[PDB]
Structure formats: C-alpha cells, structure tokens
Amino acid sequence: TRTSVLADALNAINNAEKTGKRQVLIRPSSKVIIKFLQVMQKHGYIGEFEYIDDHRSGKIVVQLNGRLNKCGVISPRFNVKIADVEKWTANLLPARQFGYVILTTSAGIMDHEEAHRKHVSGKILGFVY
C-alpha cells in the first residue's frame, strides 16, 4: 500500500534525476507534494512542474534542469523543536552554505532557513540540496 505519498514523489524525482532525465510523472499529487515542489522552485532545485486534473487525485508532471542532486523525505515526521533544527541540518545537509531541510510549521511548509527567520518550527518533511 502507498503510505507516504511524498516519499514516492521524491523517490521518483531522485530516480529520474540520477538517470539524467529532465522530467518526472508523479501520480498521486497531494497538497504536500505541491508545496514541496513549490519550495524547490523558489530555491531553484527544480524547473517548471504541472498539475494534471483527473478528478481522481490528479497527477503532476515535473520539469528538471539537472541542478538538483537529491531529494528525500524524513518518513517519520519528527516533531522538531527550534533547538533541534541545527542538528537536523548538520545530520542531513552536506554543507552549511546551502541545502534546505523542508519542514512543515504551523505557518505552512517552509525551508529551514525561512522557519528560523519566522522563529517558528514544527514537524520535518524532507531535505533538498
């Protein structure tokens, strides 16, 4: 069964990036996937994606440009206190100069730097760099 849909989306993105493609077809296309790809667009790790209405969960077509190197979900959406954000960035991101731990706060789904700017923190969604 499909438990974590965002996991399937990010795995498809990773597989279609490693092989050198420029597009992905993500099937289930929830809110969280849309927000995740929107954050990636805002930070440039992704190109020009697309929602395809089916009246049944829709789908998404993602355009890439080879700029991304790895997505990935933290499947147990751990409650991340504002003190533990730095530990997650150290454990996940490869360098302090870039990378983004995408986490869902009460103020929406945001990158870790933006959440630290709002001085708000919530559960962790995934990581992109």
């Binding site: 069964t1 089916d54 009246h55 049944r56």
Partner: protein, 151 residues
C-alpha cells in the same frame, strides 16, 4: 494489484470517464431513470444488477452521472435498501455454499481452507459495516445464521 487474500497482482478495472456531467447524446429523463431504478429494485434486484441493466439495455452510463445520486443511495431514499449490504450477502451465500459442500464431503481440505478465507473476509466486511452502523452492533456470523439470512 493487492489481492487481499491471495498472491494475485491484477489491475483489471474500469476507468470512469473524466466528465461528471451527463453525456451529450443521452436523451432520457433523470426522473424516468429513477423510476426505472425503483422498478428494477421492486423486481428484487441488487444495485449492481440494476446498474448493469441500465448500462446494457439503456443509455445510462452511470446513475450518479445522470441523476446525481448513487444507485444504493437512490434506493435508500425510497426505502428499498436491503437490511444486509449486497457484497456481505453474497459473501454469506458463498460461505454457506462452501460449508454445504464441506459437510457433504469431509476429506476435501482445499475447500476447508477456502471457507476459512471466506469467513475471514466476512468478518472484515462485517466489522466495517458495523463501525459505520449499517448493521446493528450485535450483528455477527455463526452457523445457521447465514442460512437464515440467505433463505
């Protein structure tokens, strides 16, 4: 492609058309379609057979597209919904049939295992229909109750 109680992996299904609204070529009336559904139910037909009859002999693609309500919903609005849901009733019928085959010949073990599978499916569906309160909370499945409900 799950096949709850076996190793099958098929996906043979039907793709509902994108357009929810009525097809352009359909000329029948929604009230007439509801009357047809009511008459078919009064004949003693379960909703699935009603839908198959409307799809084959008539231009009804599906009731929700034409009327706006589902077949079982339409029957319930008119008070013709059976006291046992159709899928659970068919599972009961299958289980009683396999139990009859078993009591007429003991040595068949494969049908014994299949009866175990059918009884597990019956229990799962009964639990679902019980948490939604379609069935009373005291509803359960034992021997000679399946025969009483079927007969």
């Amino acid at each position: 492609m799950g096949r709850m109680h076996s190793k099958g992996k098929g996906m043979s299904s039907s793709a509902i058309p994108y357009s929810r609204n009525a097809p352009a070529w359909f000329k029948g009336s929604s009230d007439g379609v509801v009357e047809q559904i009511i008459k078919y139910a009064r004949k003693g037909l379960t909703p699935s057979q009603i839908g198959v009859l409307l799809r084959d002999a008539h231009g009804v693609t599906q009731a929700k597209v034409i009327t706006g309500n589902k077949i079982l919903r339409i029957l319930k609005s008119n008070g013709l919904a059976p006291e046992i849901p159709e899928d659970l009733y068919f599972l009961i019928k299958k289980a009683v049939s396999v139990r009859k085959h078993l009591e007429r010949n003991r040595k068949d073990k494969d049908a014994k295992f299949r009866l175990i599978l059918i009884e597990s499916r019956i229990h799962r569906l009964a639990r679902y229909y019980r948490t939604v309160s379609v069935l009373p909370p005291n509803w359960k499945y034992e021997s000679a109750t399946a025969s009483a409900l079927v007969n």
